């Protein structure tokens, strides 16, 4: 609440002291995590703070705009009308925490849409003049965030996960050496690998009971999806079964040994590693489960899914019992190539989408890109209660986008199923 007072101060009277407090609060904004320190600094020096209650119209389709924004909290509905009356505006999508919008002020272009707060919200705003100055001075650090024509239409293991893989392999080679070895299966020999069930066994017994095998599976998956732990053949998902997996370091015949320094390192630096995977586990697990058809999920899968839906803000306007039923019906879909068209304006639709990873461009004929959506954002909700065709097109803005999808047939079945009480 301190940063708010800093932003509520005049720009010219802001000490680099204030700038530091505002900076800290803003460094975490999804749309900012890719900003050059100096850029995010300028913003802290010229930006303002707005707190809006639900139901307020920030601005209207057809007007000349005055500010650029970043959602700090709450969410907003983007509405567009095909007529001349705002009465005919339908909600196209919803913007959430971390998303920015309003860049059409750069060339004085009239707003393509009407934005209405959907709930109590907090925004960071930058006025026209300032924003234009910033854009000219930090363009290359923005061309990936802004919709065309101000930005562009579109745009191996991790480093942390690659370290956890290292740290576990040594703890296993240290405490349970017998776990990594050549294994004979069917007149064939698999070199230096581990066994699914035994990895789970070992994870549970190490620090923290981890409470369950399922939890363990999610945590190992975190490594297998990032490529540090791979199924001896190719499988994309980790299974608590008699299947062989291999760590990266064991990819070559000859391999170095944890030369004490590491062991000393692993020793101390292992505890947090488990806690880290523990945190990152539930997600990886859900995306592995949702790949199973609605009728092939165990009582346990649905719980793992449910647990995670509770963290999805786009679903916070739904009853617990409703979200419970949703786990057995949710659909998951990813697309590897940017430029891919999820659906086009004019097509029938019956699906509501929520973004898990990536971003998309919302295109409306004759106008172009009216706004870009990111993680946490959702679109197509109108298709769950209305038969009108898609009022816009959705195009992937980058590679490897993940989505959560809810279809109208399944949503209604649930809504009435819950009327049975």
From Swiss-Prot:
Q: What is the annotated tissue distribution of the protein whose record heads this document? A: Expressed in cerebellum, pituitary, adrenal gland and liver.
Could you name the Gene Ontology cellular component terms for this entry? cytosol; hippocampal mossy fiber to CA3 synapse; membrane
Task: State the UniProt keywords alphabetically.
Answer: cAMP, cAMP-binding, Cytoplasm, Exocytosis, Guanine-nucleotide releasing factor, Membrane, Nucleotide-binding, Repeat
Q: Which GO terms describe its biological process?
A: adenylate cyclase-activating G protein-coupled receptor signaling pathway; adenylate cyclase-modulating G protein-coupled receptor signaling pathway; calcium-ion regulated exocytosis; hormone secretion; insulin secretion; positive regulation of insulin secretion; regulation of exocytosis; regulation of synaptic vesicle cycle
List locations, semicolon-separated.
Cytoplasm; Membrane
Protein residues bound to 3',5'-cyclic AMP:
380-383, 390-391
Gene Ontology MF, one = cAMP binding
Residues of the DEP domain: 174-249
Asked if the record carries the keyword Protein biosynthesis, the reply is: no
Q: What is known of its domains?
A: The N-terminal nucleotide phosphate binding region cAMP 1 has a much lower affinity for cAMP as compared to cAMP 2.
What function is annotated for this protein? Guanine nucleotide exchange factor (GEF) for RAP1A, RAP1B and RAP2A small GTPases that is activated by binding cAMP. Seems not to activate RAB3A. Involved in cAMP-dependent, PKA-independent exocytosis through interaction with RIMS2.
Subunit-structure text: Interacts with RAP1B, RIMS1 and RIMS2. Probably part of a complex with RIMS2 and GTP-activated RAB3A.
| Annotated protein name in UniProt | Rap guanine nucleotide exchange factor 4
Source organism (scientific name): Mus musculus
Of the intact sequence, the residues represented are 13 to 463 of 1011
